[PDB]
Structure formats: structure tokens, C-alpha cells
Design a protein around this nucleic acid. Structure first.
Length: 147
RNA sequence: GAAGACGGUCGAACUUGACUAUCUAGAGGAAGUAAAAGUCGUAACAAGGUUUCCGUAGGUGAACCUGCGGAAGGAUCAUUA
């Protein structure tokens, strides 16, 4: 299987396409993990560091997240099988990088970590601005600027 | 001595701009209370495993942590030339 990057658009010819995201449920009750297997390839296909899309699930779900250089596992704590992610797999696009003028997420970020500001720019119609101040992930991005 | 006309004086109503009082519709946003077999933790109650609480300021998935100055409603009404 393969998919469009976002399912709010039903078009077969939509500009954005990527591999599936698949995960393992591991352990037993009071200590369950969900580990995301494709995360480095999905982060490469979306042109972002793999910390940002992993951190967004913990911000929405109300859950802990882990990262590890010794084992390369990316983890969201608790059981999040099937619909518990797959109803909202669009979200890292749908709550950040859709343009309000047109539904075309051909979109870039630049971080000014010395001055508490994240700049945003979409190629599709020239839409520019910043990320939202009520939204969760802004406090993580300013402490973790892009490569 | 009839119709009619100039001038005053009451003043309904009409046009135009502004102010204002009630009721009423709405993209989208952000909160509160019912219900008690959803999810991730374990902040408070026994020294609750870092005593707790107040004012103010900064910081984070969340409960919350840290700096400065107070309170006991404390876990001491007491410590010896």
C-alpha cells in the first residue's frame, strides 16, 4: 500500500504522496508501548526531523514519547493501535502547513531561536506568516531548531 | 355680500444626515456543567516517600517544577556555663 500525504483531499492526482506509517504494540498492561517503525523514512519523505512528527502525537493524545540513539526506536507510550492514530494521521499537515487560501501543503519553516519566533512560507500561492500561539508544538520547535 | 389672492400664527406629515434603546440572525473561535466500565501519569490526604500553604516572576504533554520574601492552619508550647 501507499497513500496521499493528507486524506482531506480525495483526488487521485494530488501533488503529495508517501509510504504507509506502521507501528508495533509492545509489552503488557500498566507498561504498554507503541513503537513507530517507518518514522525515519516518513520524516525523510516529509522533509522534517523525526522528533517533530513523533512529538505531535504526544501533544494531541496526552501521552509520553521516547527517542533513542542507541537503538533507533521512536515511541509513543500506551496502546495507540488502528483508528487511535489512523483517524488523525493527517494532523501533522492538517493543523500546521495547509494554506488557508488553497489546500496545497508545499510549505517550509524557518526558526529564530534567539527571538522566540517561527516563520512559515507556502510555495503554492505565496502565503506567509508564523505558526499559531495557542497550538502545542511551538515550545518544542524553538528548543530544537531544524538542520 | 360669495369665490379668490398677499402677510402672520398654530402644526400634522414628507425628504436627508447623525445619535440612541430593545429584540434577532451568523463563518469561525474559546469556555462551563451533567453522565462514570475511555487514555497517559501519580500532584494532595500518615514526615503521602522533596512538610504544606500565601504574594510575585520565569519554565514545561498534563497534573506541576524552580528563584525571592512571609505563615503554622507543623512533624518543635522544652535543651541546660
Amino acid at each position: 500500500m501507499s497513500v496521499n500525504v493528507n486524506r482531506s483531499v480525495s483526488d487521485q492526482f494530488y501533488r503529495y504522496k508517501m509510504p504507509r506509517l506502521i507501528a508495533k504494540v509492545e509489552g503488557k498492561g500498566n507498561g504498554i508501548k507503541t513503537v513507530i517503525v517507518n518514522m525515519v523514512d516518513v520524516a525523510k519523505a516529509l522533509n522534517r526531523p523525526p522528533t517533530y512528527p513523533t512529538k505531535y502525537f504526544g501533544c494531541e493524545l496526552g501521552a509520553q514519547t521516547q527517542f533513542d540513539v542507541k537503538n533507533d526506536r521512536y515511541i509513543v507510550n500506551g496502546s495507540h493501535e488502528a483508528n487511535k492514530l489512523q483517524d488523525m494521521l493527517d494532523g501533522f499537515i492538517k493543523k500546521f502547513v495547509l494554506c488557508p487560501e488553497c489546500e496545497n501543503p508545499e510549505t517550509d519553516l524557518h526558526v529564530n531561536p534567539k527571538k522566540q519566533t517561527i516563520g512559515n512560507s507556502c510555495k503554492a500561492c505565496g502565503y506567509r506568516g508564523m505558526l499559531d500561539t495557542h497550538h502545542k508544538l511551538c515550545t518544542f520547535i524553538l528548543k530544537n531548531p531544524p538542520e
